[PDB]
């Protein structure tokens, strides 16, 4: 009895503190306020809701023999839990979609979505989750012949619906569990091809004349497009960060970069900044097999970790409920509670595996924890 209560309280505390730290950090520093971080904030909020209102309350009901808090509390908690779970899944899928669209349509996407549009998408996903789950359960409880589950049980009565239960489960995980996979696979392919075509482009740049390069860049910049200005702004504002990576670059060819800067001394910002930030990135990430292979391996490992974690933690329920309306009483009731806990477990690891990786939170959260 002690083990069950000790393996649940610690998990709940970990999830709650992890998500609360992210939520505070998003409003504790001005550096993470970037629009790209809103999806992370929504995901952290959904995970916090799960960890603060479901894990503890489910452990309470599992420890004792019944959710004796009444027919109101049971239904309301159940609806809140399912809404939060689908909110987490939708936020993960949206993060995947943004990741895919940020590497295949760089200029177009970056220039075709600012602030409100992102908040609009997040709200749309939240509303989709709420409309899909929250209404149906309680409206069915009101419109069914009678609320007939058990005097002390809390499992949803919708579980016995071959056209609904299977349908809902598919539309909730079977679709995103494959869309995420396809999108991330395409991202891996396009980052391999990106390295290849960057190396080829860098070689051509090395062969190409410099004066023609400057003339072409100036001509392209003059015909300002909706997104070219945004790309110029991003590159110029990031340039100090890029230069820091120059030290990471080998000194074997530092003469080339120094010379290129020397001739680029004129045209201070419009040409020098972009030209250097382009040559440096090309040299550093095209290079040869030595660096390209390491980069692709690192990307693939990170992608595989992120995917596999969710895919393996969120299947202890999907398949067991797919069989449920397929093999009558095929599962042991003692096992059901394990997948139930595994879903929450996913909701716990998720902030750790999505937010810390950015490495701007990696130190900010620790500094906030130390209070200094």
């Amino acid at each position: 009895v002690a083990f069950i209560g000790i393996t649940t309280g610690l998990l709940s505390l970990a999830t709650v503190t992890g998500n609360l730290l992210v939520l505070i950090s998003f409003k504790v520093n001005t550096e993470l306020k970037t629009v790209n971080n809103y999806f992370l904030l929504s995901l952290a909020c959904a995970d916090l809701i799960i960890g603060t209102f479901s894990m503890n309350l489910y452990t309470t009901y599992l420890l004792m023999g019944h959710w004796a808090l009444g027919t109101l509390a049971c239904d309301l908690w159940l609806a809140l839990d399912y809404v939060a779970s689908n909110a987490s899944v939708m936020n993960l899928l949206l993060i995947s979609f943004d990741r895919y669209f940020s590497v295949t349509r760089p200029l177009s996407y970056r220039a075709k979505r600012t602030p409100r549009r992102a908040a609009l998408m997040i709200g749309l996903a939240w509303l989709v989750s709420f409309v899909l789950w929250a209404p149906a359960i309680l409206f069915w409880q009101y419109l069914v012949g009678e609320r007939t589950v058990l005097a002390g049980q809390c499992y949803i009565q919708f579980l016995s619906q071959p056209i609904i239960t299977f349908g809902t489960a598919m539309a909730a995980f079977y679709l995103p569990v494959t869309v995420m996979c396809t999108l991330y696979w395409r991202i891996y392919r396009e980052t391999k091809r990106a390295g290849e075509r960057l190396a080829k482009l860098l070689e051509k740049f090395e062969a190409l004349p410099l004066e023609d390069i400057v003339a072409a860049l100036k001509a392209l910049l003059a015909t300002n497009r909706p997104e070219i200005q945004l790309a110029v702004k991003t590159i110029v504002e990031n340039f100090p960060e890029i230069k820091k990576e120059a030290e990471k670059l080998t000194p074997e060819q530092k003469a080339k970069l120094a010379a290129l800067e020397a001739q680029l001394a004129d045209l201070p910002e419009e040409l020098r900044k972009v030209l250097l930030s382009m040559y440096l990135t090309g040299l550093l990430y095209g290079g040869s097999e030595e660096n390209r292979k390491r980069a692709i391996e690192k990307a693939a490992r990170t992608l595989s970790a992120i995917l596999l974690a969710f895919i393996l933690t969120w299947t202890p329920y999907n398949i067991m409920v797919l069989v449920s309306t397929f093999c009558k009483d095929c599962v042991p009731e003692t096992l059901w509670e394990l997948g139930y806990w595994l879903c929450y477990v996913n909701s716990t690891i998720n902030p750790m595996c999505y937010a810390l990786c950015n490495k701007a939170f990696r130190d900010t959260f620790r500094l906030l924890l130390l209070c200094r």
Partner: peptide, 27 residues
């Protein structure tokens, strides 16, 4: 020249792509 400008645009697009990958720590 036209082709040169096209290549320059491709290069700047690729630079933005590398920046975007860096910002996700998914490099």
């Amino acid at each position: 020249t036209p082709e040169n400008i096209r290549f320059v645009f491709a290069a700047v697009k690729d630079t933005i792509l590398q920046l975007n990958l860096k910002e996700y720590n998914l490099v």
